[PDB]
């Protein structure tokens, strides 16, 4: 399954509750909810310049880091963070918005994970050539006009749409535990079976 299991989680979303009401809020989602359940303290560190917090499921000790900045900082976040770490991109996983997929929906990825999008590539570009990088897909965009999508990605959802993104998050957040306990492949065929309809 996994040679080396993940010692750095990174999660993209709009920062701060003013604009986390809206719906590219999936990275961010998914890290407070891992605060809450360990109970543990999500760290402010200018290190990075973010809030990162290390929490131990199972056996595996989740270090889980949130940016201030989601386009420049993001990836300059996760360029210090995976340097000290000394963290490998097999042991690196992102928790990253996602218009690409519907509400309610999850998917794992494991190699080409990158879009038109700095805080999304320059994670690649800030750490060298890495190819080999992990990463999660957050479905938050729902399918309408496609060419009026950009009015969804990162347009207020509400609670009733919002729960199918809750619903994503709550088995997004329990399905590392089975990644690191019986394989990733396991929690990836729970991952993308979880869908909202």
């Given at each position: 399954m996994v040679s080396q299991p993940i010692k750095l989680l990174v999660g993209l979303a709009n920062p701060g509750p003013e604009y986390?009401?809206?719906?590219?809020?999936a990275g961010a989602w998914v890290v407070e909810e891992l605060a809450r359940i360990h109970n543990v303290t999500l760290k402010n560190e200018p290190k990075f310049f973010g809030l990162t917090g290390r929490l131990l499921i199972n056996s595996q000790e989740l270090r889980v880091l949130i940016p201030?900045?989601?386009?420049?900082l993001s990836g300059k976040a996760i360029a210090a963070l995976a340097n000290f770490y000394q963290i490998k991109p097999e042991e690196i996983m992102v928790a990253h918005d996602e218009l690409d997929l519907p509400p309610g929906v999850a998917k794992f990825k494991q190699g080409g994970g990158h879009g038109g999008h700095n805080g999304l590539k320059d994670t690649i570009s800030k750490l060298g050539n890495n190819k080999e990088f992990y990463r999660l897909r957050l479905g938050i965009g729902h399918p309408g006009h496609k060419d009026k999508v950009a009015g969804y990605v990162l347009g207020k959802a509400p609670a009733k749409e919002q729960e199918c993104l809750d619903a994503a998050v709550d088995e997004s957040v329990r399905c590392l535990e089975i990644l690191m306990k019986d394989g990733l492949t396991k929690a990836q065929n729970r991952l993308h079976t979880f869908k909202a309809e």
């Open positions: 986390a009401k809206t719906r590219h809020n201030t900045t989601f386009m420049n």
